[PDB]
Design a protein around this nucleic acid. Structure first.
Ligand SMILES: [Zn+2]
Lengths: 314, 132, 101
RNA sequence: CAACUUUGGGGCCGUUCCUUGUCUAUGUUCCUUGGAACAGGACGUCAUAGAGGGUGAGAAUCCCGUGUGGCGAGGAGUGCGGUUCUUUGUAAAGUGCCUUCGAAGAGUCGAGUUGUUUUGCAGCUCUAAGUGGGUGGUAAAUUCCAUCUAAAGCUAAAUAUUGGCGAGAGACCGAUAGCGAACAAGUACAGUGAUGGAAAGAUGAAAAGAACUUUGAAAAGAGAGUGAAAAAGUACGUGAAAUUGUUGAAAGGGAAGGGCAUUUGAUCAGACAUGGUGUUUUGUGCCCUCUGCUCCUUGUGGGUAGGGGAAUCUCGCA
RNA sequence: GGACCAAGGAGUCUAACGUCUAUGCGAGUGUUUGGGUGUAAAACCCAUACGCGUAGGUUGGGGCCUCGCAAGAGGUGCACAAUCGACCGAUCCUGAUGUCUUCGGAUGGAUUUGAGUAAGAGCAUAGCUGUUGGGACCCUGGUUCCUGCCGAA
RNA sequence: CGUGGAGGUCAGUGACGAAGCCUAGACCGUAAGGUCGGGUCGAACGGCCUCUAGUGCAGAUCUUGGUGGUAGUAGCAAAU
């Protein structure tokens, strides 16, 4: 919630200029909506499959037709409300700032200059792979890249021999305002994926519907994010779109509970675990101590021995 | 019925945790009403038009009361004159939000409502008119 | 944001969290003092934090402030603990003065 | 009549298109394991190349490629771009104004009937008009207005495509699945025919496929050997159950099974456990002292050097 | 109904209405026929249309306020319900001012009327489910994991 | 609880042995089941948060394959 972020050089140091937050990072983070949108968006790049039309006669039979011949007209793509999809992207963008989320997904960002990490626009003008990799070394995302590079494993499924042989983790995401050969330079290094600010792919944003991929920004892209999503000051550049509101202003509930004035208005609390009373029943008519927590007359009753009392001879 | 929100809005569950701390630790029935209202479905949370809010502010002795809507405050252009008052709710349509702000009033969230009235001092709760 | 971050970590994927056969959860967070992944336990869900942790020989107290939520390279503060057991516990109580139990 | 305005045809060389050909990065660096490093560790280089495949196991860097560009070759061709050669002969065309004219789909339209279709179509019979005809609204009604030119013809593109010729993919199936057919599958086979129609994938990295001796008609053996492995021998990856043989144990004598609980017999598991507390001896160091250097998050900080001392203290270690 | 054993083997998909729930927006809502874009069946942006919807009183009464130590009292009253209303449309009579000799409805009645007015709630997506139809669980017979809770005729 | 496949993650496991099989071996689960030892074996495979389904068998005189008894019996072109 700080106002501004120091841009960093390609050599990697606090450049004296700083940029205000684009207020997109103040968006509500709704992982339920990100999840529901992510399922339907992940269902988009799908090719259909089917069994043969006519190609005994039993589902139980060897070589017969199967039960439920899989037909093509089963639904493949899923229609999504456009504001809802934009809302999921906005929650993803706001989640990328936090970086407890980025560590919570699994990234090696423990030695990076700050969050959200912003580099100069000169990064865009790099057109060779080794220079851009050395630039990310100078940033400090080297450990994330080494994680991705070590993480190349072979797929456990049958889909290994369905052209999906290798698998590995995902790494940094570089956001540029404009290509100047950067997307060719980072194409060869694994785990890195670039994105114009106009697109900002949700699948690239929250992979596996887990919020907060490690995202690197260029300087012009970070300014351009205000153009892309708007603010209370800049309009939206999207037709009739608004960065959506919160239903609760303060993100911390325990701050509100422990503030001062709720703490004034509230009755005193219990022990925070219940003091067990009467864990076991001790019978009277024996155990004379629990007989004496009852009926204090019983002591002088036994003292006078009235149970054996001799009556008058009258 | 529901003893919990069947929704999975995280912020909603945060407000449920806050108002369950209130409804345990307060003695006013207000926070109990707020907790029971937080569990309601979308059908059981009908929207409240701002026209109905102003018609409610036409009640006697209510002008210095605040109004609370567990639900959505929606706009209606059928009204012109809207008083300067304080409305707390879950959701604000931008038309109704501009009606409240443009009338000099105040658009409040329910966390700020709990901060202002922990015991529900001087309040109003309105429910949308359900038909179907 | 800490309770939002916590409910994301809890109800969705905490990458460090390990599920026991018992049902109990375990963060592999290197700064986590207890082994568990609970509300107090995740260093990711809490901005005031502390941890006894050893680098090659010497044991260091690691302090985490909300003041440095950004800049995670400069996040952890390091204190060299004494080899005197009593003195180092006293040092803990000093640096965690007015701090939670 | 007044002006204007215009010229066509070749060539050639490029270009464009097709079909090709060729060139264009970086480790085979040390160690361990392994039959084999393409595995693991350490140190690297390339990248507009970390797609994919092969190479005795997960190969960016071994090879082919991949990526980026480059150089060709042979055609197609008017698409245009330059050059070059010619093209006129009262040649062809266009625009405005004036004058004089100003010709079009008949066995068709239509009508009846029959069948057919849900109004067309077909048959049979009849069969027109030329300010004509077709079609539709309209009415204050001896109506007005609208809108096209039938009975001659051609026409790219947007479209369909379970076939052909090719590509590229898959949240598809993994050998009873997927095509009937991963294999010498429309095969073997069956039917007189029309037709119907199977089963059947895996030695190994390399056949290195078992030299030689011997039994044995011959089939099969036994010695021997290859191989990392025949607990891989062309019956061959792995090798479940049903079922079979031998041996051992036990029980049974025309005995059926389980459940509980216990003995007996057989059998298995059963510390790499070996420490803590206090005291004491001596020695050592981030212990003490003096002299530094260095990183910022600049503090209740972090790293680090030199010499001296435990003679005294003190911490940790031994 | 059964010689045994292995593998295979039976409520799938789609369309149309319907409830519920979740989500976004909200009197609006719906990007993806299509165009632009692209790292290319993904994502991103969207012009014009179109679709569906929109276009008074009394009694209580959640609460809330005040007073009351409390108990309670008073006030304002959400949703919703009942009453008495009102009005619109209908209903059957009245049939005026006018009236082209058959036009006219003025006024006053009367009951019910109606998802009527008297200050909206919908649209879209997803999920689970109800009915119907496509071969539609498979071929009378069969119909594939556990536990907990509720549990008839 | 289990099964095939998919997204993310565990810089998860693996030729010093994955998966599979056997296990008069141990353990945890009320159970569905899961974990380990040992043996065999040779190249891939798992846990977690989600998605998706051709997702769970004892029967259907189910389909296909394999193997019994009948039985050394019937019987000798029952196929040669
Ligand atoms: Zn955790």
């Amino acid at each position: 919630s700080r106002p501004q972020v120091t841009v960093h050089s390609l050599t990697g140091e606090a450049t004296a200029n700083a940029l205000p937050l684009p207020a997109v990072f103040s968006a509500p983070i709704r992982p339920d909506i990100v999840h529901t949108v992510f399922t339907s968006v992940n269902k988009n790049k799908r090719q259909a499959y089917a069994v043969s039309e006519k190609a005994a006669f039993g589902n139980m039979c060897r070589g017969g037709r199967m039960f439920a011949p899989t037909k093509t007209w089963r639904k493949w793509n899923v229609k999504v409300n456009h504001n809802e999809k934009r809302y999921a992207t906005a929650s993803a963008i706001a989640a990328t700032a936090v970086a407890s989320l980025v560590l919570a997904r699994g990234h090696r960002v423990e030695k990076i200059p700050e969050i959200p990490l912003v580099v100069s626009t000169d990064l865009e003008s790099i057109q060779k792979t080794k220079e851009a990799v050395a630039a990310l070394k100078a940033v400090g995302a080297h450990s994330d890249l080494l994680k991705v590079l070590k993480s190349k494993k072979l797929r456990a499924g049958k889909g290994k021999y369905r052209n999906r042989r290798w698998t590995q983790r995902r790494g940094p995401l570089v956001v540029y305002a404009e290509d100047n050969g950067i997307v060719k330079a980072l194409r060869n290094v694994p785990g890195v994926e670039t994105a114009n600010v106009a697109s900002l792919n949700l699948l690239q944003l929250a992979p596996g519907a887990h919020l907060g991929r490690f995202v690197i920004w260029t300087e012009a892209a970070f300014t351009k994010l205000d153009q892309v999503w708007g603010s209370e000051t800049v309009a939206s550049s999207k037709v009739g779109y608004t960065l959506p509101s919160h239903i609760i202003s303060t993100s911390d509930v325990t701050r509100i509970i422990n503030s001062s004035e709720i703490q004034s208005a509230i009755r005193p609390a219990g022990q925070a675990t219940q003091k067990r009373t009467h864990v076991l029943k001790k019978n009277p008519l024996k155990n004379k101590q629990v007989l004496l927590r009852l009926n204090p007359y019983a002591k002088v009753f036994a003292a006078e021995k009235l149970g054996s009392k001799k009556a008058e001879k009258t | 019925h529901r003893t919990a929100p069947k929704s999975d809005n995280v912020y909603l569950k945060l407000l449920v945790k806050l108002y369950t701390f209130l409804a345990r630790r307060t003695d006013a029935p207000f926070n109990k009403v707020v907790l029971k209202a937080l569990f309601l479905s979308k059908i059981n949370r009908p929207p409240v038009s701002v026209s109905r809010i102003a018609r409610a502010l036409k009640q006697e002795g209510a002008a210095n009361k605040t109004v609370v809507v567990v639900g959505t405050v929606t706009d209606d252009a059928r009204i012109f004159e809207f008083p300067k008052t304080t409305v707390a709710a879950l959701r604000f349509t931008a038309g109704a939000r501009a009606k409240i702000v443009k009338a000099g009033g105040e658009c409040i969230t329910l966390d700020q409502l709990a901060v202002r009235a922990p015991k529900g001092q001087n309040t109003l709760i309105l429910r949308g008119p359900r038909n179907s | 944001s800490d309770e939002i971050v916590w409910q994301v970590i809890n109800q969705s994927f905490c990458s460090h969290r390990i599920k026991a056969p018992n049902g109990q959860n375990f963060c592999r967070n290197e700064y986590n003092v207890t082994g568990l992944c609970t509300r107090q336990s995740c260093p990711l869900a809490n901005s005031k934090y502390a941890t006894v942790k050893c680098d090659n020989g010497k044991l260091y107290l690691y302090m985490k402030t909300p003041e440095r939520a950004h800049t995670p390279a400069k996040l952890w503060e390091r204190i060299k603990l004494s080899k005197n057991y009593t003195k180092a516990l006293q040092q803990i109580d000093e640096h965690l003065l007015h701090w939670s139990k």
